[PDB]
Amino acid sequence: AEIYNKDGNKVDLYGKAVGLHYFSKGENSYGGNGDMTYARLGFKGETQINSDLTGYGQWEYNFQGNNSEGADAQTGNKTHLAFAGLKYADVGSFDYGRNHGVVYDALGYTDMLPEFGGDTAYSDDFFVGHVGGVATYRNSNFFGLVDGLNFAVQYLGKNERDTARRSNGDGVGGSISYEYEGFGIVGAYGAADRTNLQEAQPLGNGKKAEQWATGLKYDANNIYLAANYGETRNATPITNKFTNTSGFANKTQDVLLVAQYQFDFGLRPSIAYTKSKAKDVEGIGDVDLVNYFEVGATYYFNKNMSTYVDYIINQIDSDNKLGVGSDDTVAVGIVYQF
Amino acid sequence: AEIYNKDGNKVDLYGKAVGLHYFSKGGENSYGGNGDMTYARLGFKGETQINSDLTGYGQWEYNFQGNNSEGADAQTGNKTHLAFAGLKYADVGSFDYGRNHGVVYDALGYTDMLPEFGGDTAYSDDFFVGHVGGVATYRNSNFFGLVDGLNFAVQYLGKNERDTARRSNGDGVGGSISYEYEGFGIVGAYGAADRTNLQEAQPLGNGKKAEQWATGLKYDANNIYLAANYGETRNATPITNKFTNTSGFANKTQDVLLVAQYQFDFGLRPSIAYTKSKAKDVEGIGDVDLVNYFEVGATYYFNKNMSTYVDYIINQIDSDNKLGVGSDDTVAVGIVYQF
Amino acid sequence: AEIYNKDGNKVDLYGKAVGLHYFSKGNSYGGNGDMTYARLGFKGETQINSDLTGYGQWEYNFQGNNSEGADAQTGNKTHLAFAGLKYADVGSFDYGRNHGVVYDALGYTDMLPEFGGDTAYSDDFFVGHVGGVATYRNSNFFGLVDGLNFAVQYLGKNERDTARRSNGDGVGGSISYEYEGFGIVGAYGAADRTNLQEAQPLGNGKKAEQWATGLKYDANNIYLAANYGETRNATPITNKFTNTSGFANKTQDVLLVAQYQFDFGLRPSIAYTKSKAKDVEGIGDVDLVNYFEVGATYYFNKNMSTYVDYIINQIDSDNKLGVGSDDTVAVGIVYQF
Ligand SMILES: [Zn+2]
Ligand SMILES: [Zn+2]
Ligand SMILES: [Zn+2]
């Protein structure tokens, strides 16, 4: 909601209140079971310094509502985004802070399900999700010459945290996308040195991490069809549920398909398929991290209100070598936003 | 404060900064405690008119404690009080899901009107008496627009297997019925739920299910506010033995609250109250008083945005209480800006 | 940003998104790596009557340099939270978490692009942000002397867990006078130290003491300021070799700041800061802070800025207290509203 536009500065305070419940049998399911209510709050501020130069800054927080008021009140509360930047004319834009990864610009094609989906976009995982300390140069329409040809280059700074799961080293990434008449093809790739703490993990053996992904999309006439393929090297985090041993998969092969139609009255049904297969797992060989079919629909009452149901037909085997949940999960959500 | 109203959507960003200090003897053996109690609140109450009959809404609220340092204890007492979204359709009623006030609190709200303290039986994360996560609530006003002033609600409570028994709950259902005429209000609320296994394993109280019910009377007109609550709980009210360092639920509680207030036209509003919560058949102590005091307080409203208040509690708890409940008085002084 | 102003109430929702990186060794002054953070708060004030006004201000810090795991809340805090009243020329009174009265003096030299104001530690009696302070503030001395401002502040005892964040009952004050672009200030405060504070190995006293003075020229796009102050049993000190925490018995604080504001936007800054601790037990006379500062800020407008802040660190490689001896340079790109 645009609350302020005086004297050349625009501030957009926005938020969502998401009443959400997960339904599953009883721990060994896709998403879990119980209350999943959360709220969001953030601002998108932007100042016109002159007709060519734009200054901007964005922050977004997540307040989980499925916690008590004692001890565990702060569980799951994060800062998803926090960055500030400058955009100049047809040259492009530069921002620094906590932002999406340059590979997520590729993975964004298939991340369009009512609640689940886009399972390959792990947070604090190099270039596929949110990540702290990224300097991003972005260019749209290639210096204002070729409409629809957008690219970005992104440098990633080392984060030596106290856990291997959420740490990273110095690295670089980039994305290229061209769109014409509602079509879209994208290519994104990035690499970084694994931190010394990550190297000591039992799972995954390497000196450098790699993520790349490509995408196809048709977005026109109330029809959305999207496909993503990508591979990771020593990047995707994995955890042996049996031994509670964590690390990184040496190689993953990721496929995502999404099919949605948008009706005029508001209902938007969704079918999707996602499979994430890890290879060369230490003492396991190949094991499926993600594998399911999706059937769900989103009803938009308007721009401000929506409800949905998202049913995951989990395809993971009961004897999965890594302890991955095999049960189905269905989510019921009612979302107010401004 | 309504910050946004356009394209059939209204947003009301609200907040308050409450300068608060507790004065007590010492004060671990007092009613409320002692020292700085400054805190801040923030939230939004959004509402969109989908059509002339259907309305969507949502509300969120957070608490930022101001009596903490910038060290390890930075977020000590930071909570999200409310978080839900819902739909209201003509005279059929309203439905929301999220974290909301419990259906028994709708009865408990009659005497929960002291300048600082009060409403002691409305524990947070305690089934139907207070703020609780994962509640689906249906509300009907004026009984489908037929009987103006006759409101009822039904509420489903999902199981929350949390790490502590104090904050856990199982599947439960509750309801409330109230009637209002010319500023008179009578209400009855009740709810029952299955206790979790971790709750059962705790000492103090043996129960298949927890039960909370309460009744309320109030007069709210001509600058006069009178109110009364009576209620009983079964395996619901959390309790702690200070000597033993053991905790659990009281098998039976009996709760009475009385409030008398006059609103002077120039802003001052004095408050007298009485509160007593007795725990019956406590495992290893039998009958023991949880809360017992008299209240004397006054709030001065400068306007709708600024106010100050003093709240003194005449603690009626004997020093020899079996559970170790505080015996000393507590007085609270507050200066509040809000919007 | 004035978010709301109807029927005599004004609310100002404000915030900042600060992209920030520290460049160092890899034992430095400021550190090394991502320092991105966000700020959010409101400054609401209502005109209750013609002569009396009510107000309240809050502010939080959301760190951006953390992950989304266990360390998500690392560095999240409430800086300010208070409410108060202001009556005509009588003055103002507010209670909550606010600035200490010694910071009003320390504010003269706390004006660098990123660092500086080392003496204004958080939760440190009267010298920085502190919780549970009742402050009476009078401007222009009941409207008699233009530019003569003073304040008195009562600090409540805070039985905080650790001695680093604890304090006892105490009183403080500040007096300032300004004339034709010049300004002089004096602030002092004393408080009863906590018993847990007294048990700590470094520092010994029945009460903590802080005072500071300041003079500055702030006109014609020039800013020169100087602060001198001394503390007794108030400044927290820590030995890295021994992992032992306490309070310096005596400190001597000097801060110098020199800036010029170019009309076109650039605003360079040079500064000098030295904090010497006297007779710390086991080490005697040691310094806590010592450096020269070279920095510039570029203000595109009121809402956007970028800066570079380079610290020449004077602390030697063999410092007895283990204070960092490496240099730190900060690069920041700041949007605010
Ligand atoms: Zn995120
Ligand atoms: Zn609550
Ligand atoms: Zn602070």
Author numbering:
A (entry chain A): 1 to 26, 29 to 340
B (entry chain B): 1 to 26, 28 to 340
C (entry chain C): 1 to 26, 30 to 340
What text does the study give?
Herein, we design metalloglycosidases by constructing a hydrolytically active Zn-binding site within a barrel-shaped outer membrane protein OmpF. We supposed that a protein containing a void space, such as β-barrel outer membrane protein F (OmpF), would be suitable for our study; its overall shape resembles the structure of host compounds, such as cyclodextrin, which may provide a structural basis for various functions, including catalysis, by encompassing guest molecules and forming noncovalent interactions. We inspected the constriction zone of OmpF, the narrowest region, approximately halfway inside the barrel-shaped protein. A coordinatively unsaturated mononuclear Zn-binding site, a common catalytic motif in metallohydrolases, was created by placing three metal-coordinating histidines.
As a result, two triple mutants, R82H/Y102H/R132H (OmpF1) and L83H/Y102H/R132H (OmpF2), were designed as the parent templates. After protein extraction, purification, and refolding, they were isolated as β-barrel trimers, retaining the native overall architecture of OmpF. More importantly, both proteins possess a mononuclear Zn-binding site in the constriction zone. In OmpF1, two designed residues, R82H and R132H, coordinated to Zn ion, as expected. Consequently, OmpF1 possesses a coordinatively unsaturated Zn-site, satisfying the prerequisite for metal-dependent hydrolysis. Due to the E71 binding, the Y102H mutation becomes no longer needed for Zn coordination, while the residue may still influence the chemical properties of the Zn-site. Of note, the empty coordination site of OmpF2 pointed toward the periplasmic side, whereas that of OmpF1 is placed toward the extracellular region. In particular, D113 shows proper orientation and interatomic distance between the terminal oxygen atom and Zn-bound exchangeable ligands as 7.9–9.5 Å and 4.7–5.1 Å in OmpF1 and OmpF2, respectively.
